[PDB]
Design an enzyme around this catalytic site. Structure first.
Site, PDB file in Angstrom:
ATOM      1  N   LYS A  99     -58.643  78.599  84.694  1.00  0.00           N
ATOM      2  CA  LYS A  99     -59.937  79.187  84.381  1.00  0.00           C
ATOM      3  C   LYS A  99     -60.961  78.075  84.286  1.00  0.00           C
ATOM      4  O   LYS A  99     -60.732  77.073  83.600  1.00  0.00           O
ATOM      5  CB  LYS A  99     -59.922  79.992  83.077  1.00  0.00           C
ATOM      6  CG  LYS A  99     -61.271  80.712  82.860  1.00  0.00           C
ATOM      7  CD  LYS A  99     -61.218  81.797  81.791  1.00  0.00           C
ATOM      8  CE  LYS A  99     -61.484  81.203  80.404  1.00  0.00           C
ATOM      9  NZ  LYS A  99     -61.482  82.291  79.376  1.00  0.00           N
ATOM     10  N   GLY A 153     -66.292  81.368  67.497  1.00  0.00           N
ATOM     11  CA  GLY A 153     -67.218  80.415  68.078  1.00  0.00           C
ATOM     12  C   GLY A 153     -66.551  79.068  68.305  1.00  0.00           C
ATOM     13  O   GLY A 153     -65.830  78.570  67.439  1.00  0.00           O
TER      14      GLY A 153
HETATM   15  N1  LIG Z   1     -62.447  81.493  71.040  1.00  0.00           N
HETATM   16  C1  LIG Z   1     -62.540  81.885  72.321  1.00  0.00           C
HETATM   17  O1  LIG Z   1     -61.560  82.124  73.016  1.00  0.00           O
HETATM   18  C2  LIG Z   1     -63.906  82.087  72.898  1.00  0.00           C
HETATM   19  C3  LIG Z   1     -64.090  82.834  74.067  1.00  0.00           C
HETATM   20  C4  LIG Z   1     -65.397  83.028  74.526  1.00  0.00           C
HETATM   21  C5  LIG Z   1     -66.460  82.459  73.828  1.00  0.00           C
HETATM   22  N2  LIG Z   1     -66.232  81.718  72.727  1.00  0.00           N
HETATM   23  C6  LIG Z   1     -67.332  81.132  71.961  1.00  0.00           C
HETATM   24  O2  LIG Z   1     -67.904  82.120  71.105  1.00  0.00           O
HETATM   25  C7  LIG Z   1     -69.290  81.813  70.884  1.00  0.00           C
HETATM   26  C8  LIG Z   1     -70.185  83.019  71.226  1.00  0.00           C
HETATM   27  O3  LIG Z   1     -70.149  83.322  72.630  1.00  0.00           O
HETATM   28  P1  LIG Z   1     -70.909  84.605  73.244  1.00  0.00           P
HETATM   29  O4  LIG Z   1     -70.432  84.821  74.657  1.00  0.00           O
HETATM   30  O5  LIG Z   1     -70.863  85.720  72.231  1.00  0.00           O
HETATM   31  O6  LIG Z   1     -72.413  84.012  73.316  1.00  0.00           O
HETATM   32  P2  LIG Z   1     -73.764  84.895  73.227  1.00  0.00           P
HETATM   33  O7  LIG Z   1     -74.889  83.920  73.514  1.00  0.00           O
HETATM   34  O8  LIG Z   1     -73.611  86.172  73.985  1.00  0.00           O
HETATM   35  O9  LIG Z   1     -73.815  85.272  71.670  1.00  0.00           O
HETATM   36  C9  LIG Z   1     -73.990  84.262  70.686  1.00  0.00           C
HETATM   37  C10 LIG Z   1     -74.902  84.877  69.630  1.00  0.00           C
HETATM   38  O10 LIG Z   1     -74.937  84.049  68.477  1.00  0.00           O
HETATM   39  C11 LIG Z   1     -76.261  84.145  67.930  1.00  0.00           C
HETATM   40  N3  LIG Z   1     -76.425  83.046  66.967  1.00  0.00           N
HETATM   41  C12 LIG Z   1     -76.716  81.752  67.222  1.00  0.00           C
HETATM   42  N4  LIG Z   1     -76.740  81.048  66.069  1.00  0.00           N
HETATM   43  C13 LIG Z   1     -76.454  81.901  65.060  1.00  0.00           C
HETATM   44  C14 LIG Z   1     -76.316  81.817  63.593  1.00  0.00           C
HETATM   45  N5  LIG Z   1     -76.491  80.643  62.944  1.00  0.00           N
HETATM   46  N6  LIG Z   1     -75.992  82.946  62.926  1.00  0.00           N
HETATM   47  C15 LIG Z   1     -75.812  84.124  63.549  1.00  0.00           C
HETATM   48  N7  LIG Z   1     -75.934  84.283  64.880  1.00  0.00           N
HETATM   49  C16 LIG Z   1     -76.243  83.216  65.664  1.00  0.00           C
HETATM   50  C17 LIG Z   1     -77.153  84.120  69.148  1.00  0.00           C
HETATM   51  O11 LIG Z   1     -78.449  84.647  68.836  1.00  0.00           O
HETATM   52  C18 LIG Z   1     -76.357  85.005  70.099  1.00  0.00           C
HETATM   53  O12 LIG Z   1     -76.749  86.380  69.986  1.00  0.00           O
HETATM   54  C19 LIG Z   1     -69.594  80.606  71.748  1.00  0.00           C
HETATM   55  O13 LIG Z   1     -69.403  79.452  70.920  1.00  0.00           O
HETATM   56  C20 LIG Z   1     -68.503  80.654  72.801  1.00  0.00           C
HETATM   57  O14 LIG Z   1     -68.257  79.379  73.386  1.00  0.00           O
HETATM   58  C21 LIG Z   1     -65.001  81.546  72.240  1.00  0.00           C
HETATM   59  O1  LIG Z   2     -61.615  79.830  76.098  1.00  0.00           O
HETATM   60  C1  LIG Z   2     -62.778  80.130  76.502  1.00  0.00           C
HETATM   61  O2  LIG Z   2     -62.952  80.844  77.535  1.00  0.00           O
HETATM   62  C2  LIG Z   2     -63.956  79.631  75.736  1.00  0.00           C
HETATM   63  C3  LIG Z   2     -65.060  79.192  76.687  1.00  0.00           C
HETATM   64  C4  LIG Z   2     -66.167  78.533  75.969  1.00  0.00           C
HETATM   65  C5  LIG Z   2     -65.709  77.445  75.107  1.00  0.00           C
HETATM   66  C6  LIG Z   2     -64.601  77.878  74.175  1.00  0.00           C
HETATM   67  N1  LIG Z   2     -63.497  78.512  74.901  1.00  0.00           N
HETATM   68 NA    NA Z   3     -63.001  78.027  66.294  1.00  0.00          NA
END
Ligand SMILES: NC(=O)c1ccc[n+]([C@@H]2O[C@H](COP(=O)([O-])OP(=O)(O)OC[C@H]3O[C@@H](n4cnc5c(N)ncnc54)[C@H](O)[C@@H]3O)[C@@H](O)[C@H]2O)c1
Ligand SMILES: O=C(O)[C@@H]1CCCCN1
Ligand code: NA
Ligand SMILES: NC(=O)c1ccc[n+]([C@@H]2O[C@H](COP(=O)([O-])OP(=O)(O)OC[C@H]3O[C@@H](n4cnc5c(N)ncnc54)[C@H](O)[C@@H]3O)[C@@H](O)[C@H]2O)c1
Ligand SMILES: O=C(O)[C@@H]1CCCCN1
Ligand code: NA
Lengths: 344, 344
Positions: free
Chosen positions: B77, B234
């Site tokens: 990925k 996050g």
């Molecule tokens: N753990 C995993 O497997 C995994 C998978 C995908 C994404 N992520 C991570 O999850 C996070 C969110 O991704 P997403 O696709 O939802 O992004 P997104 O931009 O769709 O949503 C993020 C949201 O967080 C809000 N935000 C920013 N700062 C904030 C705060 N202090 N308090 C509350 N809200 C706040 C933003 O306004 C936005 O709406 C990113 O860090 C991403 O890298 C993790």
């Molecule tokens: O496992 C994932 O897809 C996410 C992408 C963004 C960074 C954190 N990990």
């Molecule tokens: Na984490």
């Protein structure tokens, strides 16, 4: 937004329209300029590649190689080394693809074959190094390993040196006997010769073998010409080497990527303080290569992602000029950026 | 041989034909069994992902995540985190694609969107952890960050817990106002609530924000319920965290991928000594998670490549049954495996 896909047909059409010689020359020229930019500190060496070892049917590896151009794009090559592919499946040992991602949005913007591109830029890199380090009147090329890379080794070197003949060896009799037909278009006459004869007679040698870990050297530790230049091109698993330690210790050694070569190149055999300046430095400032044509020299080639990014740019320019390729919406871009299920 | 490409329209068709609940349940089921297999030593954790940080337009990252199923296939990925994408381009913050390579030969066999797949398996992973670590009678889910991931966090958790209510917060008012519409298909009543109220009232919380490095926490260290379970979802740049250190130091903490969590998860704030068994070990032996249902617990979620491989298998199974996708000849397979110029 859709991904620009250059399939095998589109890559074939670029090479067919431009011609093998002109396309190799473009990649040689782009590589030379790009390496010089690294040497001047205008660009960075690519990060170390990573990989996954595979033991069956014979030991191989599958590797990923990123290179970033900040603010523009990121290139990723994924490439397998599977040396039983030709005999077992009629597939090339080296099988890969190259992708381009937008640095601002992360979007996948282009995807193309990496088989031909890999062979082209690998030959090109040896040509850049051999222009610096082989005698400019070099007449006899030696090839140890006469598989896929040997073809573009011979091709690229014949464009930069006045080669009249190639002395070639492969441990597989079928593979060395078929090399003359694959090489015919270059006009360089091919003769099969045992490795000791190649060591004695060649002005320049490329080793590009699928030799197993710990089963080198593929060139014997024996008499070589005073001015010999060797492109050590074979590289895959940690512990795989092709040249005899005694010859390497006597040579001026330049690596394409010092940290990578110390891990996967001939420099595995050398103390890190024994390395000459890397190829990019020689391209930016030839003082370090001055006089090295007339003594023993080795270009330790492992390949690195910047070379693939550069060769991909050459292909993309040609394809864009000709409107080649297809557009495929691969990535899901929901009309609502915050709704993964908005399958708009 | 050609590459099977599942584009955006095919992934949309899979969702439409299978249904969202059924698709998410299939991914939850595959993830739970696959994690248990790791916990029993029948499978192994993916290697550490690699990544490249980007500073413009706002700090983001681009990552590559390989996973190998020996003798079968390799999954890779490639995914970007570009948190200005929604506001600047109408694109999702998380943009990616998933490729499958034959492990025997290295050939690229399949390629699909990673945007929806990522949201699905990230929700599924939280559901697996929360089923193990949250009270089985949890009624109130808290969500900090109501962007893309929050939608599938709510969906997946609603399938494994008796959720009646979601208390949600985002720093962007338009994003928190639109969440109820994006969440309507789950039937769970959504209320906007400030972080202090979410901390005080929720039985389970997922934090999934684009908060910048050093700008946490996104949840205050105030009164929480004794049994609170948090999915810390996050994750992007080194130095990015979401939870208060004092809360984390009081919690039972389990990572999905310990070395990745120590680098990019909440475990950045902790000593490596301080972690519990990883999620896979809890799936294999839930007796270690049952006791912690009634005490403070954190699932530190970074995402790892095995989850993407498992979710891809779900999509390919459904797509094959419905004859979806296209076939594209991307890789060059020369008519002569030893001749890179032998274009088909
Ligand atoms: N753990 C995993 O497997 C995994 C998978 C995908 C994404 N992520 C991570 O999850 C996070 C969110 O991704 P997403 O696709 O939802 O992004 P997104 O931009 O769709 O949503 C993020 C949201 O967080 C809000 N935000 C920013 N700062 C904030 C705060 N202090 N308090 C509350 N809200 C706040 C933003 O306004 C936005 O709406 C990113 O860090 C991403 O890298 C993790
Ligand atoms: O496992 C994932 O897809 C996410 C992408 C963004 C960074 C954190 N990990
Ligand atoms: Na984490
Ligand atoms: N440096 C780079 O950038 C770069 C790029 C691509 C490939 N490579 C490497 O080059 C090597 C060859 O690749 P290829 O695509 O030509 O593979 P190939 O399988 O097409 O050719 C390898 C040939 O070496 C022969 N061989 C094996 N052991 C030998 C020995 N002891 N002596 C002589 N010949 C021997 C095999 O019989 C085969 O004909 C591999 O290690 C590959 O990973 C390097
Ligand atoms: O740079 C490359 O593409 C080659 C592939 C095979 C292993 C060594 N490096
Ligand atoms: Na080498």
């Amino acid at each position: 937004m859709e991904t620009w896909v250059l399939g095998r047909r589109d890559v074939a059409e670029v090479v067919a329209a431009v011609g093998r010689d002109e396309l190799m020359r473009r990649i040689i020229d782009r590589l030379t300029g790009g390496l010089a930019e690294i040497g001047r500190g205008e660009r960075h060496l690519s990060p170390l590649r990573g990989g996954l070892e595979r033991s069956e049917p014979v030991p191989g590896i599958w590797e990923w190689m990123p290179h970033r151009e900040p603010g523009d794009h990121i290139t990723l090559k994924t490439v397998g080394y599977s040396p039983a592919n030709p005999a077992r499946f009629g597939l090339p040992t080296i099988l890969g693809t190259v992708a381009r991602y937008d640095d601002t949005t992360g979007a996948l913007t282009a995807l193309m074959d990496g088989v031909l591109l890999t062979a082209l830029r690998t030959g090109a890199a040896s040509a850049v190094a051999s222009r610096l380090l082989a005698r400019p009147d070099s007449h006899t090329l030696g090839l140890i390993g006469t598989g896929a890379q040997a073809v573009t080794q011979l091709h690229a070197l014949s464009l930069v040196l006045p080669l009249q003949r190639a002395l070639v060896w492969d441990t597989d009799p079928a593979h060395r006997e078929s090399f003359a037909r694959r090489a015919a278009f270059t006009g360089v006459s091919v003769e099969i010769a045992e490795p000791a004869r190649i060591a004695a007679e060649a002005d320049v040698i490329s080793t590009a073998t699928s030799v197993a870990v710990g089963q080198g050297p593929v060139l014997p530790d024996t008499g070589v010409r005073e001015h010999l230049h060797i492109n050590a091109v074979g590289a895959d698993l940690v512990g795989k080497t092709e040249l005899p330690l005694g010859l390497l210790e006597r040579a001026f050694v330049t690596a394409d990527h010092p940290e990578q070569a110390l891990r996967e190149g001939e420099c595995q055999q050398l103390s890190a303080d024994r390395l000459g300046p890397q190829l990019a430095h020689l391209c930016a400032d030839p003082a370090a290569a001055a006089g090295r044509q007339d003594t023993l020299s080795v270009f330790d080639s492992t390949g690195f992602a910047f070379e693939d990014a550069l060769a991909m740019e050459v292909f993309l320019e040609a394809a864009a000029e000709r409107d080649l390729g297809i557009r495929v919406g691969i990535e899901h871009h929901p009309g609502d950026a915050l709704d993964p299920y908005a399958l708009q």
